[PDB]
Write a protein that binds this ligand. Sequence first.
Ligand SMILES: [Zn+2]
Length: 44
Amino acid sequence: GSSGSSGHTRKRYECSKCQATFNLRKHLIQHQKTHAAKSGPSSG
Ligand SMILES: [Zn+2]
């Protein structure tokens, strides 16, 4: 339909931490909270 390439994004929001998909934008915002695992290779 004479569409324009400009625009490479999915209709859903993916998580670059657990590879999970979400429907609501705000839903992912909070989900990312549990992904606040600051690098800690020196943790017993
Ligand atoms: Zn995630």
